[PDB]
């Protein structure tokens, strides 16, 4: 969940206030309130987002030639479903025996 | 007379045959592992 949480954080921080910070210098229309928006969300947010993007870019780069990140690809998960099928068949047989017993009443 | 005896005997025989059919079904419904113990765990 590490990479998933990192991607979620990057997505939530993708729409930073840098794109909306283009109306911060015009806040001085009362004297020669929210003037603090021109400092924290002017360029520091964009700088942090770019730093995070660069960090995410420089990963291990595992995938080189073929098909990595496998892990099912194989055995008795199939036979696990088969055992579930055996459980179902036993259920059917128990139901037939119960019907026979009911008829035996 | 032995008519009631014969009637009870016939009823018991019918019940025995019914129980035998139930047991016959139970045989197949109860093996249930012999066919598939080759890959059971």
Features:
part of a larger assembly, 2 chains, A: mainly alpha, 4 helices, B: 41 residues, mainly alpha, 1 helix, nucleus (chain A), Mediator of RNA polymerase II transcription subunit 11 (chain A)
Secondary structure layout plus pairing:
The structure is cut from a larger assembly and holds chains A (105 residues) and B (41 residues).
Chain A: H1 2-12, H2 37-40, H3 44-57, H4 77-103
Chain B: H1 3-31
Question: Quick gist of this model?
Answer:
Chain A is mainly α. Chain A has helices spanning 2-12, 37-40, 44-57, 77-103. Chain A contains four helices and no strands.
Structural class estimated from helices and strands of chain A:
mainly alpha
> Could you give the order of the helices and strands of chain A?
HHHH
CA-based gyration radius of chain B: 18 Å
Q: What is the helix content of chain A?
A: 40-55%
Main structural class of chain B:
mainly alpha
What proportion of the residues of chain B form beta strands (DSSP E)? under 5%
Give the number of helices of chain A. 4
Tell me the β content of chain A.
under 5%
Calculate Rg of chain A over CA atoms. Answer: 31 Å
| Strand segment count of chain B | 0
Order of helices and strands of chain B: H
Distance between the termini of chain A: 58 Å
| Helix residue percentage of chain B | over 70%
Oligomer: part of a larger assembly
Shape of chain B: rod-shaped
| Total number of strands of chain A | 0
Helices of chain B, by number, come to: 1
- Largest interface, Cβ cutoff 8 Å: A-B, 12 and 12 residues
PDB class: structural protein
Keywords: mediator, structural protein
Entry title: CryoEM structure of TR-TRAP
Chain A: Mediator of RNA polymerase II transcription subunit 11
């Amino acid at each position: 969940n590490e990479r998933l949480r990192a991607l979620e954080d990057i997505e939530r921080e993708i729409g930073a206030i840098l794109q909306n910070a283009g109306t911060v210098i015009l806040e001085l229309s009362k004297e020669k309130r929210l003037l603090d928006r021109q400092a924290a969300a002017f360029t520091a947010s964009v700088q942090h987002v770019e730093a995070e993007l660069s960090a995410q870019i420089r990963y291990l780069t595992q995938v080189a030639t073929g098909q990595p990140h496998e892990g099912s690809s194989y055995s008795s998960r199939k036979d696990c479903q088969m055992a579930l099928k055996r459980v179902d068949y036993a259920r059917l047989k128990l139901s037939d025996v119960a019907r026979t017993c009911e008829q035996m009443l | 007379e032995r008519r009631e005896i014969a009637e009870v005997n016939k009823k018991l025989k019918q019940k025995n045959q019914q129980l035998k059919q139930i047991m016959d079904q139970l045989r197949n419904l109860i093996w249930d592992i012999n066919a598939m113990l080759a890959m059971r765990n």
